[model samples]
Target: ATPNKTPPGADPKQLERTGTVREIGSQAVWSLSSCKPGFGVDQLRDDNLETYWQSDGSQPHLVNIQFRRKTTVKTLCIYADYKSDESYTPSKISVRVGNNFHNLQEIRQLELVEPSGWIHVPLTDNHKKPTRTFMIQIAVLANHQNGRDTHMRQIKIYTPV
Candidate 1:
């Protein structure tokens, strides 16, 4: 039998395969903003670090995930390559939870500096409610050393089973 395993290069301590939370599959994900060719929203959950979701130098890029039913998101994991592409990492990120794209409520706001590897952000709060749709809005991007593009290596959402 094939041994159950987390994606290679992923943080073993992360929520990815800890058995405490279930990872939402990539089939439920969609992009609200366009990415460059080959670097699409699906890359966010492709379990590969070499691939990424590249934004088109646009402020406030958005990606959304929809579940068949309401799901409780306990945490969000974002993987960025600050070591090799430090300048392209995101500077500010905002997460919104709701039922649809037009109707979203901000649940988290973050400011990052020289982030590398997996960055975990909690999604649960007293004021927030579980939803069938969740959205991630990248408000500000770090400066690219050589170009005007920003890349997010991977994004993972976890819910307690």
Candidate 2:
């Protein structure tokens, strides 16, 4: 499915269509920096666009995925709903990948101009080896008229064979 509009600052090439995009996040342990009672971290991988995981407390909110065993993750896809609330979308996202959760290496730090729809980011370094943990820590969030809370519709990790 195509997004309503291409998000600003997003690469059109990366957004190109692909086949057999598997949804792989259920096995991992989902944790967040802070969240509301019902809107927990697990909602990120629930495959529901309507449902989202929102930060209830502060900026620099974190979302960590710890796999049961080593797994190869080549691409990371995120759905940031601009239609729902543009201000609630993340402006800056920092991604870290490694086997050790404590010492995860910073792989990518993106500054989004106008984040919307589904964002596809390639993690070239992490594809070299199977990793046990992947972390997406939000460093900065868009300013919302209502609140500082950030909303994420989905987070999908894929290993293209």
Clashes of each: 0, 0
Best by TM-score: 1
Show where candidate 1 strays beyond 4 Å: 1-17, 127-148
| Candidate lDDT (C-alpha), each | 0.65, 0.66
Candidate 2 pairs with clashing backbones: none
- Where does candidate 2 stray beyond 4 Å? 1-21, 126-147
Query: Candidate 1 lDDT, tens digit per residue, 1-161?
Result: 21431223447245545677687655364654668888887677678889988877466666666665666677778886566666667666787777766777887787665565777777766566443444543444334354356778787776667
Question: What would the per-residue lDDT of candidate 2 be over residues 33-143, giving only the tens digit for each residue?
Answer: 888876766677676878888788877778877776767666777777666867786766888877656767877887654556677777766356533344433344444
State how far residue 10 of model 1 sits from its true place (Å). Answer: 8.5
Once all C-alphas are superposed, what RMSD does model 2 give against the true structure?
A: 5.2
Error of 1 at 46 (Å): 1.7
Q: What is the lDDT of residue 33 in candidate 1?
A: 68
In terms of lDDT, which candidate is strongest? 2
TM-score of each: 0.77, 0.75
